């Protein structure tokens, strides 16, 4: 299923880049070579100014630096929050969970902070 | 339109340079590289050099390379 | 006058055309006339007898209502037609 | 049935929803605003402030400040005194 | 009276004394959000104090949601420290409690009609607009939302003393309209 | 290189047709206008790339 | 002989022209502002009355 | 000069690596590579918008969130992606959203 969608995307991409390859004057063999390599690669403190009186008031910032864990990239239509919970109308997008990819149109989410 | 706002952008870049404080005059091609004007045609640049750079009062020409006149503004 | 002329005048009045893009069209279709009525200060309607009008210095008048069709063309290939009955 | 009591008129709530969804225009950076202004002047020699505000999508006060910095108001026979996007 | 209002939310403003870059703070902060189209400030939230703070490019910040004055001050200091850790010269200047909100229950139904009739000069009861009666106390500048269920919410206080004094003043009046 | 030059000449041949299309009606002007419109979107679209690289 | 009818018909035609005139003005202001308009609010009954 | 969302995914990474190989081989110029990336972004956006007609659900807890330039950067933990056909469990997820 997902591989079939990927093949359709390949067809769309090549068709979309043909015109640019003609505009820039480059030979068409580049597209064939690109597709071949792409497929192969895929498969009392009165003086309060000092703030040092408190320490370890944060968390590890390395999660955003790593980003190695599963990542979901999509578009959002509505996102509401009522004092505890975050609600998500995320529309069509892509998800990368455990390497395997997932495709969706409507995504509904509820989370707690 | 074409080939007008680019000239305006160059002149604005010159003001930005002068807020920087680099009195040393700079080459027009280097200015184009800094302002992402490579895409523009060369002929428009040549027309600018021949006519607009001299017409602009703030601009000055020294040793074959164009920059503002440090005398015009009060120091 | 009441039976023919009022309705004919309303019909002959050209449809209102507005545009400034979506455009609205207002058409006045039908005339309705109720019996002479008087509204008390509390807002309760009640039939107004001519003797009561004479005594209370009221005007012997009948409410007048028109059916108005408003059609809006949004340029999106759909036109919405809403009818206000007895405005 | 006329003038039936209502908390808010349908047109008013629709317009308020549109305004809230669109949100107020944001104050973008001077460089980007200037570039957009110069691009607009290329399309048209003379611009009115009202339409220039629509083109730039910037606050009126901020746009007026940036435009006062470079462009200049010319009093003209087109119909009224309008801005000129040419710095000189 | 035997009843003391308990604070539900405290608003405190503090100046950091330095201009800030809202976009940079939004990009680098943990829980911060920045929507210039919607609001001109940056909204950040910290769970451990369980509070929300708005930070403006002018360097002034507003902290809300703190249930205590100490919690409000600590949360403001934490927000300032986060901004400072983001590299800005943030400080803690002229921290002040602009407004305090308290809540309580009188444990008996109230006749808001009689209350407004007696204290029309300070009372405002409009069931169409809001079911709760709004009472504007003068000696403390406190606004009280009194409800038929007995719940009373005081707002506009700068110090907890004002909240307690306002409740002490209002309780004898309410007791005279017990339902 | 000569073959490339001949191919290039056909470009000018068809740009003649382009003029005759203006004379029939401006296609080049329309293309330029279209190019002008993208610049703003590209700047807005671009802004996201720099910050996303910093974020991830 | 112009009896009550024709005379009232003349007056009513004039007043209905007016009514549609204010309706046009009121609706035009809202349309220019881009917001839809309420037909009931557009009508001035005092004109005819 | 486009939305530029799917570049930092498996598909975009593979395309970028292929373009890097051709650039190393001098077969394609970097401007051509950038143009290919732009066209890929357009095509992928259109394809996901059109050929996807399935709904998904998920629940969990949120540990962090960020917003700037209409870009949400939520960070959830212990998420359960529930679908009518299958259920997936994940310890942590980062949801990047744009519009």
UniProtKB/Swiss-Prot annotation, chain B:
The keyword Cytoplasm does not apply. One of its GO terms (molecular function) is DNA binding. GO terms for biological process: transcription by RNA polymerase II; transcription initiation at RNA polymerase II promoter. It comes from the Eukaryota. Keywords: Acetylation, Disease variant, DNA-binding, Nucleus, Phosphoprotein, Transcription, Transcription regulation. Residues 1-75 bind DNA. Disulfide bonds: none annotated. The keyword Nucleus applies. The modification N6-acetyllysine is found at residue 3. It is found in: Nucleus. Coiled coil: none annotated. GO terms for cellular component: cytosol; nucleoplasm; transcription factor TFIID complex; transcription factor TFIIE complex. Recruits TFIIH to the initiation complex and stimulates the RNA polymerase II C-terminal domain kinase and DNA-dependent ATPase activities of TFIIH. Both TFIIH and TFIIE are required for promoter clearance by RNA polymerase. Tetramer of two alpha and two beta chains. Interacts with FACT subunit SUPT16H. Interacts with ATF7IP. Interacts with SND1. Part of TBP-based Pol II pre-initiation complex (PIC), in which Pol II core assembles with general transcription factors and other specific initiation factors including GTF2E1, GTF2E2, GTF2F1, GTF2F2, TCEA1, ERCC2, ERCC3, GTF2H2, GTF2H3, GTF2H4, GTF2H5, GTF2A1, GTF2A2, GTF2B and TBP; this large multi-subunit PIC complex mediates DNA unwinding and targets Pol II core to the transcription start site where the first phosphodiester bond forms. Belongs to the TFIIE beta subunit family. This is Transcription initiation factor IIE subunit beta. The chain holds residues 72 to 146 of 291 of the full protein.
Swiss-Prot record, chain D:
DNA binds at residues 77, 79. It is found in: Nucleus. TFIIF is a general transcription initiation factor that binds to RNA polymerase II and helps to recruit it to the initiation complex in collaboration with TFIIB. Belongs to the TFIIF beta subunit family. Heterodimer of an alpha and a beta subunit. Interacts with HTATSF1 and GPBP1. Interacts with URI1. Interacts with GTF2B (via N-terminus); this interaction is inhibited in presence of GTF2F1. This is General transcription factor IIF subunit 2. It comes from Homo sapiens. The gene is GTF2F2. The chain holds residues 151 to 238 of 249 of the full protein.
Swiss-Prot record, chain F:
Disulfide bonds: none annotated. It is found in: Nucleus. The TFIID basal transcription factor complex plays a major role in the initiation of RNA polymerase II (Pol II)-dependent transcription. TFIID recognizes and binds promoters with or without a TATA box via its subunit TBP, a TATA-box-binding protein, and promotes assembly of the pre-initiation complex (PIC). The TFIID complex consists of TBP and TBP-associated factors (TAFs), including TAF1, TAF2, TAF3, TAF4, TAF5, TAF6, TAF7, TAF8, TAF9, TAF10, TAF11, TAF12 and TAF13. Component of the TFIID basal transcription factor complex, composed of TATA-box-binding protein TBP, and a number of TBP-associated factors (TAFs), including TAF1, TAF2, TAF3, TAF4, TAF5, TAF6, TAF7, TAF8, TAF9, TAF10, TAF11, TAF12 and TAF13. Component of the TFTC-HAT complex, at least composed of TAF5L, TAF6L, TADA3L, SUPT3H, TAF2, TAF4, TAF5, GCN5L2/GCN5, TAF10, TAF12 and TRRAP. (Microbial infection) Interacts with SV40 Large T antigen. Belongs to the TAF4 family. It is linked to Intellectual developmental disorder, autosomal dominant 73: An autosomal dominant disorder characterized by intellectual disability ranging from mild to severe, developmental delay, speech delay, behavioral abnormalities, and non-specific dysmorphic facial features. The gene is TAF4. The chain holds residues 942 to 1011 of 1085 of the full protein.
UniProtKB/Swiss-Prot annotation, chain H:
SUPFAM superfamilies: Transcription factor IIA (TFIIA), alpha-helical domain, Transcription factor IIA (TFIIA), beta-barrel domain. One of its GO terms (cellular component) is cytosol. GO terms for molecular function: protein heterodimerization activity; protein homodimerization activity; RNA polymerase II general transcription initiation factor activity; RNA polymerase II general transcription initiation factor binding; RNA polymerase II-specific DNA-binding transcription factor binding; TBP-class protein binding. Gene3D superfamilies: Transcription factor IIA (TFIIA), beta-barrel domain, Transcription factor IIA gamma subunit, alpha-helical domain. It comes from the Eukaryota. CDD domains: TFIIA_gamma_C, TFIIA_gamma_N. Keywords: Host-virus interaction, Nucleus, Transcription, Transcription regulation. It holds the Pfam family TFIIA_gamma_N. It is found in: Nucleus. Its main location: nucleus. InterPro entries: TFIIA_a-hlx, TFIIA_b-brl, TFIIA_gsu, TFIIA_gsu_C, TFIIA_gsu_N. GO terms for biological process: positive regulation of transcription by RNA polymerase II; positive regulation of transcription initiation by RNA polymerase II; RNA polymerase II preinitiation complex assembly; transcription by RNA polymerase II; transcription initiation at RNA polymerase II promoter. TFIIA is a component of the transcription machinery of RNA polymerase II and plays an important role in transcriptional activation. TFIIA in a complex with TBP mediates transcriptional activity. Belongs to the TFIIA subunit 2 family.
């Amino acid at each position: 299923t997902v591989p079939k969608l990927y093949r359709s995307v390949i067809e769309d991409v090549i068709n979309d880049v043909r015109d640019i390859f003609l505009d820039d004057g480059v030979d068409e063999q580049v597209l064939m070579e690109l597709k071949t390599l792409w497929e192969n690669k895929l498969m009392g403190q009165v003086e309060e100014e000092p703030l040092n009186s408190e320490d370890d008031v944060s968390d590890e910032e390395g999660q955003e630096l790593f980003d190695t864990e599963n990542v979901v990239v999509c578009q959002y239509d509505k996102i509401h929050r009522s004092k505890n919970k975050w609600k998500f109308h995320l529309k069509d997008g892509i998800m990368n969970l455990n390497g395997r990819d997932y495709i969706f149109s409507k995504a509904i989410g509820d989370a707690e902070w | 339109g074409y080939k007008f706002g680019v000239l305006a952008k160059i002149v604005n870049y010159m003001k930005t340079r002068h807020q920087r404080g680099d009195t040393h005059p700079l080459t027009l091609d280097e200015i184009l590289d800094e302002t992402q004007h490579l895409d523009i045609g060369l002929k428009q640049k040549q027309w600018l050099m021949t006519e607009a750079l001299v017409n602009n009062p703030k601009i000055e020409v020294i040793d074959g390379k164009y920059a503002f006149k440090p005398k015009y503004n009060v120091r | 006058f009441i039976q023919m002329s009022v309705q004919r005048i309303v019909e002959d009045a050209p449809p209102i055309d507005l545009q400034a893009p979506p455009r609205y069209l207002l058409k006045f279709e039908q005339i309705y006339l109720s019996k002479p009525t008087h509204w008390e200060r509390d807002g309760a309607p009640s039939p107004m007898m001519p003797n009561e009008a004479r005594l209370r210095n009221l005007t012997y008048s009948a409410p007048l209502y028109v059916d108005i069709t408003k059609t809006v063309i949004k340029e999106g290939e759909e036109q919405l037609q809403t009818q206000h009955q007895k405005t | 049935t006329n003038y039936k009591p209502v908390a808010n008129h349908q047109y008013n709530i629709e317009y308020e929803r549109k305004k809230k969804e669109d949100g107020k225009r944001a104050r973008a950076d001077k460089q980007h605003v200037l570039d957009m202004l110069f691009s607009a002047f290329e399309k048209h020699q003379y611009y009115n402030l009202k339409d220039l505000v629509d083109i730039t999508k910037q606050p009126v006060v901020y746009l007026k400040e940036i435009l006062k910095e470079i462009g200049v108001q010319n009093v003209k026979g087109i119909h009224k005194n309008t801005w000129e996007l040419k710095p000189e | 009276s035997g009843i003391v209002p308990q604070l539900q939310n405290i608003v405190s403003t503090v100046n950091l004394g330095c201009k800030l870059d809202l976009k940079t703070i939004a990009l680098r902060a943990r829980n911060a959000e920045y929507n210039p189209k919607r609001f001109a400030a940056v909204i950040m939230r910290i769970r451990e104090p369980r509070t929300t703070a708005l930070i403006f490019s002018s360097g002034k910040m507003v902290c809300t949601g703190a249930k205590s004055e100490e919690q409000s001050r600590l949360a403001a200091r934490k927000y300032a420290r986060v901004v400072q850790k983001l590299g800005f010269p943030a400080k803690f200047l002229d921290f002040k409690i602009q407004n305090m909100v308290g809540s309580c229950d009188v444990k008996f139904p109230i006749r808001l009609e009689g209350l407004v009739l007696t204290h029309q000069q300070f009372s405002s009861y409009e069931p169409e607009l809001f079911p709760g009666l709004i009472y504007r106390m003068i000696k403390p500048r406190i606004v009280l939302l009194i409800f038929v269920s007995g719940k009373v919410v005081l707002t506009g206080a700068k110090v907890r003393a004002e909240i307690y004094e306002a409740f002490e003043n209002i309780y004898p009046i309410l007791k005279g309209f017990r339902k | 290189a000569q073959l490339k030059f001949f191919e290039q000449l056909d470009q000018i041949e068809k740009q003649r047709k382009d003029e005759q299309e203006r004379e029939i009606l401006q296609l080049r002007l329309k293309q330029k206008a279209k190019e002008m419109q993208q610049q703003e979107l590209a700047q807005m679209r671009q802004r996201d790339a720099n910050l996303t690289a910093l974020a991830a | 002989l112009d009896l009550a009818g024709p005379l009232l018909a003349f007056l009513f035609r004039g007043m209905f022209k007016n009514l549609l005139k204010e309706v046009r003005i009121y609706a035009q202001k809202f349309i220019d502002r881009g917001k839809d308009f309420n037909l009931e609010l557009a009508i001035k009954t005092r004109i005819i009355s | 000069m486009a939305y530029q969302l799917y570049r930092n995914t498996t598909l975009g990474n593979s395309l970028q690596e292929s373009l890097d190989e051709l650039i190393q081989s001098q077969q394609i110029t970097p401007q051509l590579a950038l143009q290919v990336l732009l066209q890929f972004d357009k095509a992928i956006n259109a394809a996901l918008a059109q050929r996807v007609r399935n709904r998904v659900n998920f629940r969990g807890s949120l540990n962090t969130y960020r917003f700037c330039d209409n870009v949400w950067t939520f960070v959830l933990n212990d998420v359960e992606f529930r679908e009518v056909t299958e259920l997936i469990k994940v310890d942590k997820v980062k949801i990047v959203a744009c519009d």
